Amino acid sequence: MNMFSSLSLVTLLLLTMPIMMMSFNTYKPSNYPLYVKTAISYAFITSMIPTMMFIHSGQELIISNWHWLTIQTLKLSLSFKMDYFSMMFIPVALFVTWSIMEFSMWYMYSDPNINKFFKYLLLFLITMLILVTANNLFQLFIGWEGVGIMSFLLIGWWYGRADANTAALQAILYNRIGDIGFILAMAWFLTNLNTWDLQQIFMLNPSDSNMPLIGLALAATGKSAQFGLHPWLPSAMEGPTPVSALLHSSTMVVAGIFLLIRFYPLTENNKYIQSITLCLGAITTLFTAMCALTQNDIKKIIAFSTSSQLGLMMVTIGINQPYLAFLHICTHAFFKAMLFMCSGSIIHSLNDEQDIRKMGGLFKAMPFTTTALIVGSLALTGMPFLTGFYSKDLIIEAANTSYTNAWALLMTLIATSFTAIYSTRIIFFALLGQPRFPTLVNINENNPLLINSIKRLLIGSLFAGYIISNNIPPTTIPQMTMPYYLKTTALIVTILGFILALEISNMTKNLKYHYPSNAFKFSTLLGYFPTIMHRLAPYMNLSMSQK
Amino acid sequence: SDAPPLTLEGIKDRVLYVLKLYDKIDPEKLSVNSHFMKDLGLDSLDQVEIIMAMEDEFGFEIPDIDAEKLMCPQEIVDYIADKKDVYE
Amino acid sequence: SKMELPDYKQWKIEGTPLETVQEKLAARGLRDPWGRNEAWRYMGGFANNVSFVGALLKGFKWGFAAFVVAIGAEYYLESQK
């Protein structure tokens, strides 16, 4: 108990101690970059001690450790919600962060402001952890903005690049829009209900919670980059790759779904939210892949490749799977973030080249890079027993074997195969074929530090996702019984994506001229949603402002 | 990215070696300062192809206006040396 | 530093598809002006490369060989109780 709670709160305060050392003193320069990493390394250990106790005891502890404010009949505190999600989502985030931690200590050697770089990387981590552990909307709101702001600087690290300034505000524009539902939700729980503490919210079990949940639906629309407020998520790839690896691949993007899960007791009864959320992911989960089938940017493609995974997570919640969707969060983060780092290896040896068509001949010229690229893809595509398959097979269970919209299941599998399609298009140019990079060879990855970074993040997907399944205790009645094809439909359509893309990929070798096609451009040009909605809408708001 | 250094002496053959694979030139007649149109008996349309190879060779675009005047290998070296600020 | 630049006649189209363009160019009545330019994309140590099938099967020989031993060891470690 005491030991469990006490040792748990150290991580949030422990992580902040290096930050307190940046605003004060000048004792030891040139060593902070390692200082932070070891703290996470140490933090991870203190993030695993709660792991043991929680699994054995399942001790969900809400700790109110202050009396901040008090209005008539309200009270705010700097409390934390030590429960399943924090105990199980924190270890993964640090694990990924720990990998990314040492990844960035090498890639950004070209930045004199590297020390500043870490002055914010550690900041975001703090806010994200506070967000998930938050017991109240307000404190939860704070993290909802910290991720919003910490992204602003990290997104726009190179403030000179016009893409950063435009993209950074594009996301901030969207990120703020999502909060409209968030602030609305607080108002409703303050008017109809009377508090922002989840204890009262769940226990009272609202009978008409359409409005508060509708705000939650909007919250995830922009923050998690769902369709309708999606375009910004790819836009983050105009800046540092390590920055994209954590914020927009593993940590910030998970915010949108997280709130719905954290309000699981309320979301169950109202199916109005479920349908639109179920449909919202449906339109997004394919619109991301449908667009992604022909995109030609290594970093953006990964963003779209991440987008579809996120788009499907909403469907997982849309099918009323509270704790099963949670797994998809951790499982996806491992490799995809590693893929960002792997994409870093490609960009490193390429000396600032990113076009997918300017890559190849890397199977043996990039042996280590080739090593982990397939696992993430195979795990991403749903290779059995791998980190991504567990969710992919499990998640498709209820959706295809429980009450769901007819059209909802339609795009559910069409894009599912597309998930593997671009992976083959990627590993093809990335690894298959003879080299196509510029004449001079800058290829070198005999860097021990990165190998440590790749080592740590290569292992987790292979084994950690498998391990994570065992310890977690029962919370649901698994639908182990279903028609064999439905149980194996993923096991049926999975191989189709590789082959179908392989059918598409190899026929392009032949020396035959090309032919334009509208759909080839509709998906390639992002469905024209960004190309249009990011011209007129700025023009409407601004060109019409003067009058 | 450790260090991608650049040296004028090392770059010397990089511009010239590009010409060493051309199928419209005798390698031995070619010189460091040889004008392409007259000394090498070439044309602007032929000269366009050489300029393009430098972009695949080194990896950086070339403006249309300044591409034409680079009729001397030294000038091409000057463009590469001067644009990247390489002096030794 | 010195970056010894090898011979410039090493790059060639013989035995590689680069000349297959030349062969088809006879019907086209032309020739590639840069025939020797891009011979490296198939020369210099890039002749053989495992295709898609090989990529997934990278290194599976050793794991496949060791996999059979591991599964049998269960029978070895289970038959004797």
């Binding site: 043996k364 010229a365 042996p367 004449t439 001079l440 060879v441 800058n442 290829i443 070198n444 005999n446 | 450790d2 260090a3 990089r14 | 530093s1 970056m3 630049l5 790059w11 490296w40 020369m43 210099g44 140590g45 890039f46």
Partner: peptide, 17 residues
Amino acid sequence: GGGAHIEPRYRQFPQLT
């Protein structure tokens, strides 16, 4: 940076280890 333990090539397979 141990004294350029890898010597880059030009149009060649990498000087790996």
